[PDB]
Amino acid sequence: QMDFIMSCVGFAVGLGNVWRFPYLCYKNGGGVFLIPYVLIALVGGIPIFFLEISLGQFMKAGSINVWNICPLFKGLGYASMVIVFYCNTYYIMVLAWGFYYLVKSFTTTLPWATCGHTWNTPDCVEIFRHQLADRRSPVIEFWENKVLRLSGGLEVPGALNWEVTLCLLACWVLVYFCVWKGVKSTGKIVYFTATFPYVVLVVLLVRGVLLPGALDGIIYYLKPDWSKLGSPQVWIDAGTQIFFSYAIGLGALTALGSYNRFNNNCYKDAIILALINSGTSFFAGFVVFSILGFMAAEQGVHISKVAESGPGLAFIAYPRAVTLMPVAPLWAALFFFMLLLLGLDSQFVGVEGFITGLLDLLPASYYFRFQREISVALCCALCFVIDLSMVTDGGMYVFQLFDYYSASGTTLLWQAFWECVVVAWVYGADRFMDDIACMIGYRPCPWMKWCWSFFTPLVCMGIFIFNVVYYEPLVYNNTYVYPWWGEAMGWAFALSSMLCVPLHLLGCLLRAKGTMAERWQHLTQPIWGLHH
Ligand SMILES: N=C(N)NCCC(=O)O
Numbered sequence: 149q150m151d152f153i154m155s156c157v158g159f160a161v162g163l164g165n166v167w168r169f170p171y172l173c174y175k176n177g178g179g180v181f182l183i184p185y186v187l188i189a190l191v192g193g194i195p196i197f198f199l200e201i202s203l204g205q206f207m208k209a210g211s212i213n214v215w216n217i218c219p220l221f222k223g224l225g226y227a228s229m230v231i232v233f234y235c236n237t238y239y240i241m242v243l244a245w246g247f248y249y250l251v252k253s254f255t256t257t258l259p260w261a262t263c264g265h266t267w268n269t270p271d272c273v274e275i276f277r278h279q280l281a282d283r284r285s286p287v288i289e290f291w292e293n294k295v296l297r298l299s300g301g302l303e304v305p306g307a308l309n310w311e312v313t314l315c316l317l318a319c320w321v322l323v324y325f326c327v328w329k330g331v332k333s334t335g336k337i338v339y340f341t342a343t344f345p346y347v348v349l350v351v352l353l354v355r356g357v358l359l360p361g362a363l364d365g366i367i368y369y370l371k372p373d374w375s376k377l378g379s380p381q382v383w384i385d386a387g388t389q390i391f392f393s394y395a396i397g398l399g400a401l402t403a404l405g406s407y408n409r410f411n412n413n414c415y416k417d418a419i420i421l422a423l424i425n426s427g428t429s430f431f432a433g434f435v436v437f438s439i440l441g442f443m444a445a446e447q448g449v450h451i452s453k454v455a456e457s458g459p460g461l462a463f464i465a466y467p468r469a470v471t472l473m474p475v476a477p478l479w480a481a482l483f484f485f486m487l488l489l490l491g492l493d494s495q496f497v498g499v500e501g502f503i504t505g506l507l508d509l510l511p512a513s514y515y516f517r518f519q520r521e522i523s524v525a526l527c528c529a530l531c532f533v534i535d536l537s538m539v540t541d542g543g544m545y546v547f548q549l550f551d552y553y554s555a556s557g558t559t560l561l562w563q564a565f566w567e568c569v570v571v572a573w574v575y576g577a578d579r580f581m582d583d584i585a586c587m588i589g590y591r592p593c594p595w596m597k598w599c600w601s602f603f604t605p606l607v608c609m610g611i612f613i614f615n616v617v618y619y620e621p622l623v624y625n626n627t628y629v630y631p632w633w634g635e636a637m638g639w640a641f642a643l644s645s646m647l648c649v650p651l652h653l654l655g656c657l658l659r660a661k662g663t664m665a666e667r668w669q670h671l672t673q674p675i676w677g678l679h680h
């Protein structure tokens with residue numbers, strides 16, 4: 149089938165693989181991040197991936213309705229919207245920044261190739277020699293003083309950055325327009341958009357290999373520092389990175405499953421999609437970390453102190469690589485066009501899911517002449533208004549609050565744990581596996597059943613508990629200690645997402661009559677579709 153290609157340009161391959169995984173690996177240390185990544189991909193990632201797709205095919209519906217199997221826990225679906233909504237709030241910003249770089253690519257030279265553009269600190273040198281710890285590369289200067297214009301901290305937002313604001317306006321109007329038409333990338337264009345990224349990456353990787361000091365970068369990427377394994381930071385980062393790269397809990401995998409036919413091979417679908425996501429993430433890791441090793445061997449700073457540890461690494465490693473290509477501006481335009489394509493396809497599927505969920509929720513009395521178009525326009529405008537607080541000088545910090553705490557962190561752990569609990573335990577993991585076998589013919593290995601029943605909830609609960617017990621305040625670029633109210637806002641996002649389940653459960657219990665026993669029994673009775 150081509151369902152893999154359909155997801156490859158959808159809720160799967162994108163910035164979460166090319167932009168996020170590299171900087172998460174860098175922030176947690178190179179080698180030590182892979183082991184929890186692999187373990188949770190085997191135990192948490194692939195199993196919930198297959199769970200979402202299988203449940204989507206089974207229920208023949210997406211977003212909220214799929215939880216008709218356990219209507220009492222239908223609030224989980226609600227949470228998905230909030231989570232994906234938060235993605236739509238900040239994901240686009242990466243695109244915006246990427247778009248800005250693309251706008252700056254179409255020049256006879258490159259703005260970040262050198263620093264003589266009157267937006268750089270005096271401590272910037274284009275070439276490095278044998279003062280010490282007092283020099284910054286032009287690429288990081290451009291990233292932190294033209295795209296971001298980074299302020300002192302979250303306490304002082306500063307002056308709104310107009311250039312990135314027009315770039316974000318262009319991204320949002322483009323999303324509005326080409327989501328209004330609903331292109332869905334057609335059927336033959338997808339082919340190109342599924343093979344254009346890798347080509348570029350491959351080229352970059354080749355260049356990345358042929359550099360002095362790239363071997364050090366690759367070794368640091370692969371060989372792990374076992375001391376960091378005890379830290380819960382790497383475990384929470386790996387679990388959330390997998391649950392984000394797969395769009396687990398965002399209510400897009402479920403719709404993608406619903407699009408498939410009933411007599412489908414969803415088990416191999418999930419396995420192949422997961423392998424593609426992990427392979428693209430590993431390839432992007434190679435591309436980023438070879439460049440990081442090159443900059444470590446060039447500047448002289450340690451490999452862990454080369455570039456930004458926050459979300460800026462993808463904008464400090466990838467552009468740098470481009471500057472080493474023969475015809476730099478053409479390759480900058482090509483790579484950032486690739487990045488724009490990935491981010492755009494992901495944003496299209498996410499916004500489509502959110503809008504369809506909202507439209508299904510709203511009653512008939514709320515119908516408008518252009519209800520779909522007006523709803524999409526209002527969502528885009530509201531998200532742009534929220535992002536107005538993230539393009540400001542002290543805007544990058546807000547982005548981190550929207551990245552670490554919102555649609556990631558303990559939010560995705562909570563969502564995945566409750567998904568596994570409601571399906572494997574409340575609904576019956578054995579019965580669900582029997583239903584999947586009826587759908588698909590054969591029987592998957594019992595490893596999936598063990599992952600659903602015990603392994604995945606246990607791993608998620610353990611990561612959450614060991615992070616909370618040894619809680620460390622979120623620090624951006626290992627320099628800025630977030631104040632109490634910054635963590636308060638981050639936890640406000642997190643609890644806004646994670647309250648959807650318990651509040652909805654409580655409201656359903658109040659609405660039901662009699663004692664809690666028969667109320668739970670009646671509200672957990674599945675509501676099957678017509679075809680079942
Ligand atoms: N939206 C997500 N949470 N994951 C999608 C991965 C991507 O295409 O970047």
Ligand SMILES: [Cl-]
Nearest residue numbers: 165169393429
């Ligand atoms: Cl990934």
Ligand code: NA
Nearest residue numbers: 160164165393
């Ligand atoms: Na991904």
